[PDB]
Amino acid sequence: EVMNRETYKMDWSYSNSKQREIKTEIIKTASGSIAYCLTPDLRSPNGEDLPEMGKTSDAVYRVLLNGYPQKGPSELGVATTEEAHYATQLAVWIAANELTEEDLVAKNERVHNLMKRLVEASKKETGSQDVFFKVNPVDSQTATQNGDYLETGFYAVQTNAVSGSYTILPENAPKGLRIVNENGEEKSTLSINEKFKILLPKDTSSGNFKMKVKSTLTNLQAIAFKGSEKVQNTTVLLQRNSEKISTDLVVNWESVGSLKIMKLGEKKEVLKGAVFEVSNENFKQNVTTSDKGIAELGNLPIGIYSVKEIQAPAGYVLDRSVKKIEVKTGETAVLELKNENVKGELEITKVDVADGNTKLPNAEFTIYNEQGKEVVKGKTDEKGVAKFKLPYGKYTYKETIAPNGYVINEETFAFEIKENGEIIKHIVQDKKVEGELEITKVDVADGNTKLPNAEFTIYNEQGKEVVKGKTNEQGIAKFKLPYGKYTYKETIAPGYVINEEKFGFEIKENGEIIKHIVKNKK
Ligand SMILES: [Zn+2]
Ligand SMILES: [Zn+2]
Ligand SMILES: [Zn+2]
Ligand SMILES: [Zn+2]
């Protein structure tokens, strides 16, 4: 920059060593800003292009931050711009080790007061031209749930810059990432005085990513310019931009939920012992249901899980159909399942022991459970069948009313409903009531005298003939007949007249022998 000069009147300080008044001028650049001189021994420039050589010391820098024209005369504690300027130049020379305080003799106490203040500030304050840049916090951060999002805390840019901005550059980050400031405003490029926070949708699988903070900072700096060495070096306080980038900042998170399986029967009741296979890619586990019908799994990575019954409870139907359920971040997905009771049937067919093809109706069977309580009764139909729909478990049954004309069956049978829809078919046999008629034929005069050749004929309740038989020897004629009411009469005489009385009898007990005596005449 080309530099330009302007003189003024002042109560100059005197140097005892140099034996002269210490003077200066106001030096101004082409743009208009005020430059200061770095030594009182060489003259200031007039209309010469001066090249940059670097920076002054931080001590000299601190004088310019605190002095004129950064601050005006009233703020600094002096009366005029000339007094403000002169005290600043003197403090610049003292901080640069070109003059010492004890060598100078002041002629203006306002000027002397300000010079002391600016020199004390160069020694005590800590402002520096080294550009400082840091992102807090420095350690890798973990995002935790807050309603709809997983979120970190706030990050902040610590710097000695006067102004600047920065941009967040995430590497391979998840979908739906948002970056916000403290007012909740969505931004990727922010001012250095703003803080930022990371949001991720809660439904994001566990993971991590790296990000970088890139910034453009503006620092004040006391730039030095190189005189010809017959002409002084100068300084100008200027704003200078500077690019900075952080090291990789890591963000990580963990996304899990739970699954609760509730097991029910046909009516809303708790069910123990149901075993389910909970699975997906990366996971498999068989869980069994508890006292309260509940099976639970925690810490499941979020996503779709398959649920499949592998083993049913005691006396319940197995259902191998697959169920699909989503585990979401922070939440317990509930799966409520009903189960069907195992049901089957007993089919009793009632027949005659002598003939398997003869079916017997109206025979009653009673059914008992494991403990022996009566569960149900039922009679055989027109084809000798009795049907009983029953639930799971072990049972017994007995004949409790015999069919008409049969001896009751005394045995106890057993069966079990194991499998669903099973039909157990049983055959029960029955002994028919059969008996004998024995007619001893004697003469009406002589008792204990035989009569062969006497034929008797036996008729049923309706009156139709059944059997004929002559008297064998000793007057005896045997006839084996089934249950029922009958009548009988003499057909053929043994040289005797026929006894034409119509006798009657009933066979009603098995193995029974009915002994009758008929007598003949002439
Ligand atoms: Zn200060
Ligand atoms: Zn003084
Ligand atoms: Zn640490
Ligand atoms: Zn009863």
8 Å CB contact between 48 and 65: no
Distance in Å, CA 266 to ligand 4 centroid: 28
8 Å CB contact between 461 and 485: yes
Ligand number nearest CA of 71 is 1
Distance in Å, CA 401 to ligand 4 centroid: 13
Query: Within 10 Å of residue 300's Cβ, how many Cβ atoms?
Result: 19
Ligand number nearest CA of 377 is 4
363: three-class secondary structure by DSSP: coil
- DSSP code string of 196-212: BEEEEESS--SEEEEEE
At 163, list the tokens: 């102004």
> What's the rounded Cα separation, in Å, for the pair 479 and 486?
12
Ligand number nearest CA of 106 is 2
Q: Hey, which residues does 393 pair with through a beta bridge? A: 417
Distance in Å, CA 135 to ligand 3 centroid: 14
Distance in Å, CA 82 to ligand 1 centroid: 21
From residue 440, alpha-carbon distances to 301, 396, 449 in Å are: 101, 49, 10
From residue 273, alpha-carbon distances to 1, 261, 310, 322 in Å are: 91, 12, 11, 18
Ligand number nearest CA of 110 is 2
At 339, list the tokens: 């189960």
Distance in Å, CA 138 to ligand 3 centroid: 7
Distance in Å, CA 115 to ligand 2 centroid: 10
Distance in Å, CA 105 to ligand 2 centroid: 8
Ligand number nearest CA of 140 is 3
Ligand number nearest CA of 374 is 4
137: preceding bond cis by omega (within 30 degrees): yes
Question: 434-520 falls under which CATH superfamily?
Answer: Immunoglobulins (2.60.40.10)
At 257, list the tokens: 């939920």
Distance in Å, CA 376 to ligand 4 centroid: 9
List all residues 6 or more positions away from 447 whose beta carbon is below 8 Å from its beta carbon. Answer: none
Ligand number nearest CA of 364 is 4
Ligand number nearest CA of 139 is 3
Q: Could you tell me which CATH number the domain at 343-432 has?
A: 2.60.40.10
Ligand number nearest CA of 368 is 4
> What's the rounded Cα separation, in Å, for the pair 489 and 441?
12
Cβ-count burial 473-506 (b if 16+ within 10 Å, e if not): eebebebebebeebebbbeebbebeebeeeeebe
Q: Which class for 208: exposed (0-12), middle (13-18), buried (19 or more C-beta within 10 A)? A: middle
Distance in Å, CA 515 to ligand 3 centroid: 119
Experimental technique of record: X-ray
Ligand number nearest CA of 141 is 3
Distance in Å, CA 36 to ligand 2 centroid: 23
Distance in Å, CA 203 to ligand 3 centroid: 29
Distance in Å, CA 140 to ligand 3 centroid: 8
Query: Within 10 Å of residue 136's Cβ, how many Cβ atoms?
Result: 11
Give me the residues near ligand 2 (ion), CB cutoff below 5 Å. 106, 109, 112
The reply to whether 434-520 shares the fold of 343-432 is yes
> What's the rounded Cα separation, in Å, for the pair 381 and 244?
100
Q: Which class for 214: exposed (0-12), middle (13-18), buried (19 or more C-beta within 10 A)? A: middle
Q: Hey, which residues does 4 pair with through a beta bridge? A: 28
At 87, list the tokens: 């005290």
List all residues 6 or more positions away from 240 whose beta carbon is below 8 Å from its beta carbon. Answer: 218, 219, 220, 221, 223
Strands, DSSP E only, in 97-159? 104-105, 133-136, 141-142, 144-146, 149-151, 156-159
8 Å CB contact between 207 and 174: yes
Q: Hey, which residues does 189 pair with through a beta bridge? A: 167
DSSP H helices in 4-80: 58-66, 73-76
Cβ-count burial 61-87 (b if 16+ within 10 Å, e if not): bbbbbbbbbeeebeebebeeebbbbbb
Ligand number nearest CA of 373 is 4
Tell me, in Å, the resolution of the deposited structure: 2.6
Distance in Å, CA 125 to ligand 1 centroid: 7
8 Å CB contact between 296 and 277: no
In one-letter notation, the amino acid at residue 104 is L
List all residues 6 or more positions away from 6 whose beta carbon is below 8 Å from its beta carbon. Answer: 25, 26, 27, 28
Distance in Å, CA 112 to ligand 2 centroid: 5
Distance in Å, CA 374 to ligand 4 centroid: 6
Distance in Å, CA 129 to ligand 1 centroid: 15
